[PDB]
Design a protein around this nucleic acid. Structure first.
Ligand SMILES: [Zn+2]
Ligand SMILES: [Zn+2]
Lengths: 69, 309
RNA sequence: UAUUUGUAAUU
């Protein structure tokens, strides 16, 4: 494989997809596009970077939070 | 004799044990009784062997059962010591499927009330499961009676949940029932746990329908809250699949009344989308079409993700 | 544009 998935889902050119793997060998984030992105919730970036949908602090939403908003 | 060890190394050792394994199917029964009688002395130490245990396992089948019994007696008196030992317990669990059920019952009577510190070992749990599969469940009533007050605390245990599934799969109604009610007590907290979801999941695809009705009734109100949770999302998954049409319709109508943006939380969140997917392929075309015409707009927010729906 | 889809103890 030797290829990332994050760059593949964003339709980056075929060389960038095969350029790097998604993460490191130590579960460190490796894809530069993901390491750039600073999490708007938990603020982490780089080694522990992640998007919003997968943030550890992405709050659990009850029906009450769906009524009030 | 070690000069022949280095005269065969030049061509308890892996070579000798595996060659015993590949040539035990040949040779004479006189050599079989020869070796077996050469082992009966102090096999208590030969159990805890990294590759003697391959040999013990291999001989527990090809020989006459007389050797199985006579070596069986050369073990009792030291079972609490050899059950926690790795190779000894590989020997045990690889030996509980060859002996007679009577000697088996003797082994069951060897350890009672010990379950506490048994499954709480890296090796005891595997043997416990192997016995719940092998031994008659009625002989294991000491297991059911060693868990009064200990069901909820050990059902979330990693080694405990396996044993729980083995009990629920290989028992009668009188044995599965009290533990099952003990599970019906602490359900709402079991689902949230990383190992309670294995237990409940095993219940939904094994137990009687009525338990599934009780559990499904103990969920109506927590669909968005648990589909958004990490472990509970699997309970929702393997819950909507195994269900009657009436309960599928009940939960489906409980979901399609979500406040629009809650549907966006469903499609977006890292877990609820699995609930959506496995919810698609169980519904009747009536409720299926009543859901296609419900969250069709939110679809236009998944073409950027990895959902080709 | 924030896009990767998600859980289990031993030779
Ligand atoms: Zn990348
Ligand atoms: Zn974050």
């Amino acid at each position: 494989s030797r290829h990332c998935v994050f760059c593949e889902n964003n339709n980056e050119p075929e060389a960038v997809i095969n350029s790097h793997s998604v993460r490191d060998n130590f579960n460190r984030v490796l894809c530069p596009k993901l390491r750039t992105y600073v999490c708007p919730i938990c603020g982490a970036s780089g080694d522990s970077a992640h998007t919003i949908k997968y943030c550890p602090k992405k709050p659990i939403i009850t029906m009450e939070d769906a009524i009030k908003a | 004799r070690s000069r022949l060890l280095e005269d065969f190394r030049n061509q308890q050792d892996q070579h000798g044990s595996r060659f015993i394994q590949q040539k035990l199917e040949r040779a004479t029964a006189a050599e079989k009784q020869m070796v077996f009688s050469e082992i009966l002395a102090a096999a208590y130490s030969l159990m805890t062997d990294v590759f003697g245990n391959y040999v013990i396992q291999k001989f527990f089948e090809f020989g006459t059962p007389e050797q199985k019994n006579t070596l069986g007696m050369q073990v009792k008196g030291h079972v609490l010591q050899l059950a926690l030992q790795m190779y000894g317990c590989r020997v045990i669990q690889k030996a509980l499927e060859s002996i007679s059920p009577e000697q088996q019952q003797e082994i069951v009577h060897e350890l009672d009330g010990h379950v506490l510190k048994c499954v709480k070992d890296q090796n005891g749990n595997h043997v416990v499961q192997k016995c719940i599969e092998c031994v008659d469940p009625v002989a294991l009533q000491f297991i059911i009676n060693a868990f009064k007050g200990q069901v909820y605390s050990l059902s979330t245990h990693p080694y405990g949940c396996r044993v729980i599934q083995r009990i629920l799969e290989h028992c009668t109604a009188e044995q599965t029932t009290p533990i099952l009610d003990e599970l019906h007590e602490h359900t709402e907290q079991l689902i949230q746990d990383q190992y309670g979801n294995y237990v409940i999941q095993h219940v939904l695809e094994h137990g009687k329908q009525e338990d599934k009705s009780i559990l499904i009734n103990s969920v109506r109100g927590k669909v968005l809250v648990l589909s958004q949770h990490k472990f509970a999302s699997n309970v929702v998954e393997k819950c909507v699949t195994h269900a009657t049409r009436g309960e599928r319709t009940g939960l489906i109508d409980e979901v399609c009344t979500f406040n629009d943006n809650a549907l966006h939380v469903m499609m977006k969140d890292q877990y609820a989308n699995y609930v959506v997917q496995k919810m698609i392929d169980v519904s009747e075309p009536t409720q299926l079409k009543k859901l296609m015409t419900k969250i069709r707009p939110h679809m236009a927010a998944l073409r950027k993700y990895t959902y080709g729906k």
